[PDB]
Amino acid sequence: ATCDLASKWNWNHTLCAAHCIARRYRGGYCNSKAVCVCRN
């Protein structure tokens, strides 16, 4: 969870993953380059 790893993956759902959630995916894991790649 390259981003913070406070609890599985800090940030993530915060807003970045929210975009993927609206799409249909669970969210997006913490990419090394701080990118929330849409994934379930």
PDB file of N, CA, C and O in Angstrom:
ATOM      1  N   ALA A   1       0.842  -1.217   0.000  1.00  0.00           N
ATOM      2  CA  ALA A   1       0.000   0.000   0.000  1.00  0.00           C
ATOM      3  C   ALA A   1       0.866   1.252   0.000  1.00  0.00           C
ATOM      4  O   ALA A   1       0.869   2.018   0.966  1.00  0.00           O
ATOM      5  N   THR A   2       1.605   1.443  -1.086  1.00  0.00           N
ATOM      6  CA  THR A   2       2.486   2.593  -1.233  1.00  0.00           C
ATOM      7  C   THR A   2       1.689   3.896  -1.244  1.00  0.00           C
ATOM      8  O   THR A   2       1.204   4.332  -2.290  1.00  0.00           O
ATOM      9  N   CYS A   3       1.561   4.507  -0.076  1.00  0.00           N
ATOM     10  CA  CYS A   3       0.829   5.759   0.078  1.00  0.00           C
ATOM     11  C   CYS A   3       0.908   6.232   1.520  1.00  0.00           C
ATOM     12  O   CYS A   3       1.080   7.423   1.787  1.00  0.00           O
ATOM     13  N   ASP A   4       0.790   5.283   2.446  1.00  0.00           N
ATOM     14  CA  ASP A   4       0.852   5.578   3.877  1.00  0.00           C
ATOM     15  C   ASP A   4       0.765   4.284   4.680  1.00  0.00           C
ATOM     16  O   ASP A   4       1.549   4.063   5.604  1.00  0.00           O
ATOM     17  N   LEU A   5      -0.179   3.424   4.293  1.00  0.00           N
ATOM     18  CA  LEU A   5      -0.382   2.123   4.941  1.00  0.00           C
ATOM     19  C   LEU A   5      -0.761   2.274   6.424  1.00  0.00           C
ATOM     20  O   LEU A   5      -0.238   1.572   7.291  1.00  0.00           O
ATOM     21  N   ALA A   6      -1.687   3.183   6.711  1.00  0.00           N
ATOM     22  CA  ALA A   6      -2.137   3.399   8.084  1.00  0.00           C
ATOM     23  C   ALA A   6      -3.050   2.260   8.522  1.00  0.00           C
ATOM     24  O   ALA A   6      -2.952   1.751   9.637  1.00  0.00           O
ATOM     25  N   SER A   7      -3.933   1.863   7.618  1.00  0.00           N
ATOM     26  CA  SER A   7      -4.877   0.783   7.861  1.00  0.00           C
ATOM     27  C   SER A   7      -5.234   0.136   6.529  1.00  0.00           C
ATOM     28  O   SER A   7      -6.181   0.556   5.860  1.00  0.00           O
ATOM     29  N   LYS A   8      -4.417  -0.844   6.129  1.00  0.00           N
ATOM     30  CA  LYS A   8      -4.554  -1.552   4.848  1.00  0.00           C
ATOM     31  C   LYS A   8      -4.082  -0.647   3.718  1.00  0.00           C
ATOM     32  O   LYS A   8      -3.214  -1.022   2.937  1.00  0.00           O
ATOM     33  N   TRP A   9      -4.626   0.559   3.681  1.00  0.00           N
ATOM     34  CA  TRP A   9      -4.251   1.568   2.708  1.00  0.00           C
ATOM     35  C   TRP A   9      -4.886   2.903   3.062  1.00  0.00           C
ATOM     36  O   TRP A   9      -6.060   3.145   2.783  1.00  0.00           O
ATOM     37  N   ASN A  10      -4.085   3.775   3.671  1.00  0.00           N
ATOM     38  CA  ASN A  10      -4.542   5.111   4.053  1.00  0.00           C
ATOM     39  C   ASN A  10      -4.853   5.891   2.784  1.00  0.00           C
ATOM     40  O   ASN A  10      -4.433   5.468   1.704  1.00  0.00           O
ATOM     41  N   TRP A  11      -5.616   6.985   2.885  1.00  0.00           N
ATOM     42  CA  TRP A  11      -5.990   7.739   1.695  1.00  0.00           C
ATOM     43  C   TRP A  11      -6.944   6.828   0.915  1.00  0.00           C
ATOM     44  O   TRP A  11      -8.002   6.478   1.439  1.00  0.00           O
ATOM     45  N   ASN A  12      -6.557   6.379  -0.270  1.00  0.00           N
ATOM     46  CA  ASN A  12      -7.363   5.440  -1.044  1.00  0.00           C
ATOM     47  C   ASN A  12      -8.833   5.887  -1.172  1.00  0.00           C
ATOM     48  O   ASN A  12      -9.166   6.734  -2.011  1.00  0.00           O
ATOM     49  N   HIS A  13      -9.700   5.299  -0.339  1.00  0.00           N
ATOM     50  CA  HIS A  13     -11.136   5.573  -0.321  1.00  0.00           C
ATOM     51  C   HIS A  13     -11.430   7.045  -0.088  1.00  0.00           C
ATOM     52  O   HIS A  13     -12.524   7.510  -0.401  1.00  0.00           O
ATOM     53  N   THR A  14     -10.467   7.749   0.504  1.00  0.00           N
ATOM     54  CA  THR A  14     -10.615   9.159   0.839  1.00  0.00           C
ATOM     55  C   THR A  14     -11.333   9.958  -0.252  1.00  0.00           C
ATOM     56  O   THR A  14     -12.276  10.698   0.030  1.00  0.00           O
ATOM     57  N   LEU A  15     -10.899   9.790  -1.493  1.00  0.00           N
ATOM     58  CA  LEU A  15     -11.513  10.490  -2.613  1.00  0.00           C
ATOM     59  C   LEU A  15     -11.068   9.886  -3.933  1.00  0.00           C
ATOM     60  O   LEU A  15     -11.840   9.814  -4.884  1.00  0.00           O
ATOM     61  N   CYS A  16      -9.816   9.462  -3.986  1.00  0.00           N
ATOM     62  CA  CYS A  16      -9.263   8.875  -5.196  1.00  0.00           C
ATOM     63  C   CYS A  16     -10.021   7.599  -5.567  1.00  0.00           C
ATOM     64  O   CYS A  16     -10.469   7.439  -6.703  1.00  0.00           O
ATOM     65  N   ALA A  17     -10.182   6.699  -4.600  1.00  0.00           N
ATOM     66  CA  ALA A  17     -10.897   5.450  -4.839  1.00  0.00           C
ATOM     67  C   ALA A  17     -12.380   5.699  -5.057  1.00  0.00           C
ATOM     68  O   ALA A  17     -13.040   4.942  -5.764  1.00  0.00           O
ATOM     69  N   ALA A  18     -12.894   6.767  -4.442  1.00  0.00           N
ATOM     70  CA  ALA A  18     -14.306   7.129  -4.561  1.00  0.00           C
ATOM     71  C   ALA A  18     -14.731   7.216  -6.025  1.00  0.00           C
ATOM     72  O   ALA A  18     -15.855   6.846  -6.377  1.00  0.00           O
ATOM     73  N   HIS A  19     -13.819   7.678  -6.877  1.00  0.00           N
ATOM     74  CA  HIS A  19     -14.087   7.785  -8.306  1.00  0.00           C
ATOM     75  C   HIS A  19     -14.362   6.402  -8.893  1.00  0.00           C
ATOM     76  O   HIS A  19     -15.312   6.208  -9.650  1.00  0.00           O
ATOM     77  N   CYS A  20     -13.524   5.443  -8.527  1.00  0.00           N
ATOM     78  CA  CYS A  20     -13.667   4.076  -9.002  1.00  0.00           C
ATOM     79  C   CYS A  20     -14.925   3.434  -8.425  1.00  0.00           C
ATOM     80  O   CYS A  20     -15.583   2.634  -9.096  1.00  0.00           O
ATOM     81  N   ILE A  21     -15.259   3.798  -7.188  1.00  0.00           N
ATOM     82  CA  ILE A  21     -16.447   3.271  -6.524  1.00  0.00           C
ATOM     83  C   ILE A  21     -17.697   3.674  -7.298  1.00  0.00           C
ATOM     84  O   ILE A  21     -18.588   2.855  -7.529  1.00  0.00           O
ATOM     85  N   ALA A  22     -17.738   4.938  -7.712  1.00  0.00           N
ATOM     86  CA  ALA A  22     -18.861   5.459  -8.482  1.00  0.00           C
ATOM     87  C   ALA A  22     -18.972   4.717  -9.806  1.00  0.00           C
ATOM     88  O   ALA A  22     -20.068   4.489 -10.320  1.00  0.00           O
ATOM     89  N   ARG A  23     -17.820   4.335 -10.338  1.00  0.00           N
ATOM     90  CA  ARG A  23     -17.757   3.602 -11.590  1.00  0.00           C
ATOM     91  C   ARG A  23     -18.398   2.226 -11.419  1.00  0.00           C
ATOM     92  O   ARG A  23     -19.388   1.922 -12.085  1.00  0.00           O
ATOM     93  N   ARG A  24     -17.840   1.427 -10.497  1.00  0.00           N
ATOM     94  CA  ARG A  24     -18.349   0.080 -10.178  1.00  0.00           C
ATOM     95  C   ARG A  24     -17.308  -0.724  -9.401  1.00  0.00           C
ATOM     96  O   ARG A  24     -17.627  -1.738  -8.786  1.00  0.00           O
ATOM     97  N   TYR A  25     -16.060  -0.276  -9.451  1.00  0.00           N
ATOM     98  CA  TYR A  25     -14.968  -0.960  -8.768  1.00  0.00           C
ATOM     99  C   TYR A  25     -14.989  -0.681  -7.276  1.00  0.00           C
ATOM    100  O   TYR A  25     -15.623   0.271  -6.822  1.00  0.00           O
ATOM    101  N   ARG A  26     -14.262  -1.502  -6.522  1.00  0.00           N
ATOM    102  CA  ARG A  26     -14.165  -1.327  -5.081  1.00  0.00           C
ATOM    103  C   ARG A  26     -13.519   0.008  -4.784  1.00  0.00           C
ATOM    104  O   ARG A  26     -13.940   0.743  -3.892  1.00  0.00           O
ATOM    105  N   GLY A  27     -12.489   0.293  -5.544  1.00  0.00           N
ATOM    106  CA  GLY A  27     -11.751   1.512  -5.398  1.00  0.00           C
ATOM    107  C   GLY A  27     -10.484   1.438  -6.199  1.00  0.00           C
ATOM    108  O   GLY A  27     -10.525   1.217  -7.407  1.00  0.00           O
ATOM    109  N   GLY A  28      -9.367   1.575  -5.529  1.00  0.00           N
ATOM    110  CA  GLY A  28      -8.096   1.488  -6.196  1.00  0.00           C
ATOM    111  C   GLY A  28      -6.969   1.399  -5.207  1.00  0.00           C
ATOM    112  O   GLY A  28      -6.900   2.194  -4.275  1.00  0.00           O
ATOM    113  N   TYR A  29      -6.096   0.422  -5.399  1.00  0.00           N
ATOM    114  CA  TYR A  29      -4.967   0.218  -4.503  1.00  0.00           C
ATOM    115  C   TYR A  29      -3.989   1.393  -4.584  1.00  0.00           C
ATOM    116  O   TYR A  29      -4.025   2.178  -5.536  1.00  0.00           O
ATOM    117  N   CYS A  30      -3.115   1.504  -3.599  1.00  0.00           N
ATOM    118  CA  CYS A  30      -2.129   2.575  -3.575  1.00  0.00           C
ATOM    119  C   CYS A  30      -0.962   2.268  -4.510  1.00  0.00           C
ATOM    120  O   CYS A  30      -0.070   1.490  -4.162  1.00  0.00           O
ATOM    121  N   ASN A  31      -0.950   2.895  -5.680  1.00  0.00           N
ATOM    122  CA  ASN A  31       0.139   2.702  -6.634  1.00  0.00           C
ATOM    123  C   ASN A  31       1.382   3.391  -6.086  1.00  0.00           C
ATOM    124  O   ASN A  31       1.268   4.337  -5.306  1.00  0.00           O
ATOM    125  N   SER A  32       2.555   2.935  -6.492  1.00  0.00           N
ATOM    126  CA  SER A  32       3.802   3.532  -6.038  1.00  0.00           C
ATOM    127  C   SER A  32       3.811   5.029  -6.341  1.00  0.00           C
ATOM    128  O   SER A  32       4.276   5.841  -5.543  1.00  0.00           O
ATOM    129  N   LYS A  33       3.268   5.374  -7.498  1.00  0.00           N
ATOM    130  CA  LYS A  33       3.181   6.762  -7.939  1.00  0.00           C
ATOM    131  C   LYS A  33       1.915   7.452  -7.418  1.00  0.00           C
ATOM    132  O   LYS A  33       1.428   8.407  -8.024  1.00  0.00           O
ATOM    133  N   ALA A  34       1.408   6.971  -6.283  1.00  0.00           N
ATOM    134  CA  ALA A  34       0.215   7.530  -5.634  1.00  0.00           C
ATOM    135  C   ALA A  34      -0.990   7.601  -6.575  1.00  0.00           C
ATOM    136  O   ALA A  34      -1.683   8.619  -6.640  1.00  0.00           O
ATOM    137  N   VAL A  35      -1.248   6.517  -7.292  1.00  0.00           N
ATOM    138  CA  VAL A  35      -2.378   6.461  -8.211  1.00  0.00           C
ATOM    139  C   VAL A  35      -3.375   5.396  -7.764  1.00  0.00           C
ATOM    140  O   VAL A  35      -2.989   4.273  -7.445  1.00  0.00           O
ATOM    141  N   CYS A  36      -4.649   5.748  -7.740  1.00  0.00           N
ATOM    142  CA  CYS A  36      -5.689   4.815  -7.334  1.00  0.00           C
ATOM    143  C   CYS A  36      -6.223   4.049  -8.537  1.00  0.00           C
ATOM    144  O   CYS A  36      -7.251   4.409  -9.114  1.00  0.00           O
ATOM    145  N   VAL A  37      -5.518   2.996  -8.921  1.00  0.00           N
ATOM    146  CA  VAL A  37      -5.926   2.183 -10.056  1.00  0.00           C
ATOM    147  C   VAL A  37      -7.222   1.453  -9.727  1.00  0.00           C
ATOM    148  O   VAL A  37      -7.256   0.639  -8.805  1.00  0.00           O
ATOM    149  N   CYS A  38      -8.278   1.760 -10.478  1.00  0.00           N
ATOM    150  CA  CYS A  38      -9.588   1.150 -10.266  1.00  0.00           C
ATOM    151  C   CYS A  38      -9.490  -0.360 -10.208  1.00  0.00           C
ATOM    152  O   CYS A  38      -9.014  -1.008 -11.148  1.00  0.00           O
ATOM    153  N   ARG A  39      -9.932  -0.913  -9.088  1.00  0.00           N
ATOM    154  CA  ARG A  39      -9.890  -2.341  -8.877  1.00  0.00           C
ATOM    155  C   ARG A  39     -10.868  -2.728  -7.786  1.00  0.00           C
ATOM    156  O   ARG A  39     -11.146  -1.945  -6.875  1.00  0.00           O
ATOM    157  N   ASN A  40     -11.379  -3.928  -7.884  1.00  0.00           N
ATOM    158  CA  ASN A  40     -12.314  -4.440  -6.905  1.00  0.00           C
ATOM    159  C   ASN A  40     -11.597  -5.410  -5.973  1.00  0.00           C
ATOM    160  O   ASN A  40     -11.408  -6.580  -6.363  1.00  0.00           O
TER     161      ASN A  40
END
